[PDB]
Amino acid sequence: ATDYDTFVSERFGSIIQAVQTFTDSTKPGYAFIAAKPKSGLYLTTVQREDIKNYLKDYNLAPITPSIISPNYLFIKTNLKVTYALNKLQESEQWLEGQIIDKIDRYYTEDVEIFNSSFAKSKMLTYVDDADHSVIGSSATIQMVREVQNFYKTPEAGIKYNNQIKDRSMESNTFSFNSGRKVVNPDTGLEEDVLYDVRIVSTDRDSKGIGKVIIGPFASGDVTENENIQPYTGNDFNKLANSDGRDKYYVIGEINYPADVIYWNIAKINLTSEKFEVQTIELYSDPTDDVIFTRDGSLIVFENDLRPQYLTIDLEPISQLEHHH
Amino acid sequence: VTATDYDTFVSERFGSIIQAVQTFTDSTKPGYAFIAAKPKSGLYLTTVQREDIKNYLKDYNLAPITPSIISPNYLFIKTNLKVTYALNKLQESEQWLEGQIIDKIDRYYTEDVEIFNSSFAKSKMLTYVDDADHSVIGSSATIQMVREVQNFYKTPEAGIKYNNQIKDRSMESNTFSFNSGRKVVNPDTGLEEDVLYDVRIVSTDRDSKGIGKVIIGPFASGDVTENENIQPYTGNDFNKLANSDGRDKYYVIGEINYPADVIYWNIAKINLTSEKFEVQTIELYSDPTDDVIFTRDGSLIVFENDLRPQYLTIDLEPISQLEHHH
Amino acid sequence: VTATDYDTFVSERFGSIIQAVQTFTDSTKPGYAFIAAKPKSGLYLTTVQR
Structure with a gap:
């Protein structure tokens, strides 16, 4: 959860009001981070592509965390x-x-x-x-x-x-x-x-x-x-x-x-x-x-x-x- | 007279083993002035049946109407x-x-x-x-x-x-x-x-x-x-x-x-x-x-x-x- | 109000030719406040009727 959510919760605390990670027993391999806009309900696909593009910032080549609502x-x-x-x-x-x-x-x-x-x-x-x-x-x-x-x-x-x-x-x-x-x-x-x-x-x-x-x-x-x-x-x-x-x-x-x-x-x-x-x-x-x-x-x-x-x-x- | 006046009357002469008073009159039962009384501790005042609800009876001033001290x-x-x-x-x-x-x-x-x-x-x-x-x-x-x-x-x-x-x-x-x-x-x-x-x-x-x-x-x-x-x-x-x-x-x-x-x-x-x-x-x-x-x-x-x-x-x-x- | 208050009221405004006052109200005769008054000397206050 907070291991990676918190960070994100720093560089974006002005929008996201809730961030937590989890796995799907089943969708093995995949790690998702749910985030709720402080400002409503669903983060915008632009707000989402920006946030995903700090994944490169912190270097990871493997397919790396899917942000999602x-x-x-x-x-x-x-x-x-x-x-x-x-x-x-x-x-x-x-x-x-x-x-x-x-x-x-x-x-x-x-x-x-x-x-x-x-x-x-x-x-x-x-x-x-x-x-x-x-x-x-x-x-x-x-x-x-x-x-x-x-x-x-x-x-x-x-x-x-x-x-x-x-x-x-x-x-x-x-x-x-x-x-x-x-x-x-x-x-x-x-x-x-x-x-x-x-x-x-x-x-x-x-x-x-x-x-x-x-x-x-x-x-x-x-x-x-x-x-x-x-x-x-x-x-x-x-x-x-x-x-x-x-x-x-x-x-x-x-x-x-x-x-x-x-x-x-x-x-x-x-x-x-x-x-x-x-x-x-x-x-x-x-x-x-x-x-x-x-x-x-x-x-x-x-x-x-x-x-x-x-x-x-x-x-x-x-x-x-x-x-x- | 006035129930309010009576409520006091008792919040004094008894204001010791009594917590509250409601002096109401029932429209079905004329000439009767009813006095609700919470014991401040238990439930019923003289559940012993009056020991208490009879002492208050024994308080009289004026009027042709009669008290009926109830719980x-x-x-x-x-x-x-x-x-x-x-x-x-x-x-x-x-x-x-x-x-x-x-x-x-x-x-x-x-x-x-x-x-x-x-x-x-x-x-x-x-x-x-x-x-x-x-x-x-x-x-x-x-x-x-x-x-x-x-x-x-x-x-x-x-x-x-x-x-x-x-x-x-x-x-x-x-x-x-x-x-x-x-x-x-x-x-x-x-x-x-x-x-x-x-x-x-x-x-x-x-x-x-x-x-x-x-x-x-x-x-x-x-x-x-x-x-x-x-x-x-x-x-x-x-x-x-x-x-x-x-x-x-x-x-x-x-x-x-x-x-x-x-x-x-x-x-x-x-x-x-x-x-x-x-x-x-x-x-x-x-x-x-x-x-x-x-x-x-x-x-x-x-x-x-x-x-x-x-x-x-x-x-x-x-x-x-x-x-x-x- | 209060008969006691009234009893005084008269043990003042008259407290001259009056010895005692009993302000009672009769349960048969509503809205009427009765004022007993001893003349302090004789029996009836204005036996001359008022």
């Missing part, structure tokens, strides 16, 4: 703060600002650091701490791993470094392109029907394993031969429809206890071409309210840039027959 | 704490550690919460819990409000309230034994008196006006006599308990007004005599919608772990160290 774990927070009407001078809009700062001040200080961790109980005491009028808060978290490629998990897998619950793992939705014509003079003569779809996990087996299955289809546009046939279990979360779509299929699988997640859309004869996205986001409920980082993973609150991962509900109180 | 209507917090710490950061035992967090959970209560018209917040106390070591990483909790009920048979004339809002089905008591008149045998033993099963009081989802039933069960088909009035509660709509004895027929005996925050029941509404029940006092648990619990009139949120240990479970969890290498 950190594997972020995000907390989708659903915050609720109840406050006293009397004791609150400015706008609700102000108050939010006042606390959404506190959250960040906790993250920067105690969390946004390698192998340091997020404790929901701590940041809530930060929230409480934001005004002299913030009587008490509560909070509900999710974990977000932002997936680089939707089509197949890495060679190795995707892991949260944390225990999730059953059926918990679920990506967002991405358009699948069937291939049929719609024949609609509204928008010409042909739209190419494309219905949303997601990738969810099902319940632990006898032995700790689930199945990573993929959202609703219309019989025809997925070819089934004995082997590859519709999944049947109802041990997962189906999604809102308006269409006659209820045929989910099975790729990869979740090892709940070892938290590893592998899937590969290929397991059903569907080329990347068929989906109009390239990136997705995987969510899942933690088991605990204390969540952890490990090799090159970093937990981070970047809220003016990932605002979708915080929501604040306030509850103004006076006196009082009622706060819900 | 405070206590709100309890059944906390299921789940603190987690770092194996290495810890030098003394889990045993010494518990005795360290509850030292804080107490510090919070007795400074901010254990007061009249004062309140409790889970988030705020879990800050105090977290603040007991160099680690101690974080903490979880799962709380319920508890109201201790003397005479399980029936609530007061005017119902019992929490001074807080609870959730649908949230309200449920601990279990108690109901002596069915009947008799059975096993294991070579004999009649074994009268068959007993564990029975209890639960609330149902609120109807379209904010109002569910307060029901009691299960039973046998059974040990309760059904009338035009007395009939098994009609439908699923709440929390049933383990029929390790197979039973299930519950009966309506009151209702919760969720908005008004009032709960009334009377076991006499079916026809069971208190004789058919082992108990006298029971516990009434509900879980709030409140991220803040409010005390109020004669109500008081207190934390007495020593004398009320049952209302706190701490499950610790040790954690492996991270990086020790550099």
Whole structure:
């Protein structure tokens, strides 16, 4: 870690706020250094080529350390703060600002650091701490791993470094392109029907394993031969429809206890071409309210840039027959 | 007159073995001036029944209204704490550690919460819990409000309230034994008196006006006599308990007004005599919608772990160290 | 307020032809503050009625 990270952390301390090295058991030979810009999220490919070009500075001929951006774990927070009407001078809009700062001040200080961790109980005491009028808060978290490629998990897998619950793992939705014509003079003569779809996990087996299955289809546009046939279990979360779509299929699988997640859309004869996205986001409920980082993973609150991962509900109180 | 004037009156003539006073008057009970009194040490003033609450009676000035020196209507917090710490950061035992967090959970209560018209917040106390070591990483909790009920048979004339809002089905008591008149045998033993099963009081989802039933069960088909009035509660709509004895027929005996925050029941509404029940006092648990619990009139949120240990479970969890290498 | 405060009030502004004062309030007769007054000499204060 610090053996080489620190140096770098000297010649570049004006940008990078977090640097640590690690190996991949598997990508033998390769040493990577994750670095987080103090100034946001991803170092720029120019900022990256400069930093790599101090590798020559310190003479090493062997292929030498790949710099790269950190594997972020995000907390989708659903915050609720109840406050006293009397004791609150400015706008609700102000108050939010006042606390959404506190959250960040906790993250920067105690969390946004390698192998340091997020404790929901701590940041809530930060929230409480934001005004002299913030009587008490509560909070509900999710974990977000932002997936680089939707089509197949890495060679190795995707892991949260944390225990999730059953059926918990679920990506967002991405358009699948069937291939049929719609024949609609509204928008010409042909739209190419494309219905949303997601990738969810099902319940632990006898032995700790689930199945990573993929959202609703219309019989025809997925070819089934004995082997590859519709999944049947109802041990997962189906999604809102308006269409006659209820045929989910099975790729990869979740090892709940070892938290590893592998899937590969290929397991059903569907080329990347068929989906109009390239990136997705995987969510899942933690088991605990204390969540952890490990090799090159970093937990981070970047809220003016990932605002979708915080929501604040306030509850103004006076006196009082009622706060819900 | 004036409750405030009275509160003082006692924060003087007794201001010795008394910590706090709430002089409130109940709108259901005219001409009666009620005086809540915290013992400053324990829970009940003359649990010996007056020894004390009679001495204060013996303080008279003016008015046609009469004092009724009572002990405070206590709100309890059944906390299921789940603190987690770092194996290495810890030098003394889990045993010494518990005795360290509850030292804080107490510090919070007795400074901010254990007061009249004062309140409790889970988030705020879990800050105090977290603040007991160099680690101690974080903490979880799962709380319920508890109201201790003397005479399980029936609530007061005017119902019992929490001074807080609870959730649908949230309200449920601990279990108690109901002596069915009947008799059975096993294991070579004999009649074994009268068959007993564990029975209890639960609330149902609120109807379209904010109002569910307060029901009691299960039973046998059974040990309760059904009338035009007395009939098994009609439908699923709440929390049933383990029929390790197979039973299930519950009966309506009151209702919760969720908005008004009032709960009334009377076991006499079916026809069971208190004789058919082992108990006298029971516990009434509900879980709030409140991220803040409010005390109020004669109500008081207190934390007495020593004398009320049952209302706190701490499950610790040790954690492996991270990086020790550099 | 306070009957005691009132008793004085009169053991001053009148403390001349008055011997004693009892300011009590009757629980049957609200909003009325009653002032007993011994004439210090006879029986009735203004038996002449006021």
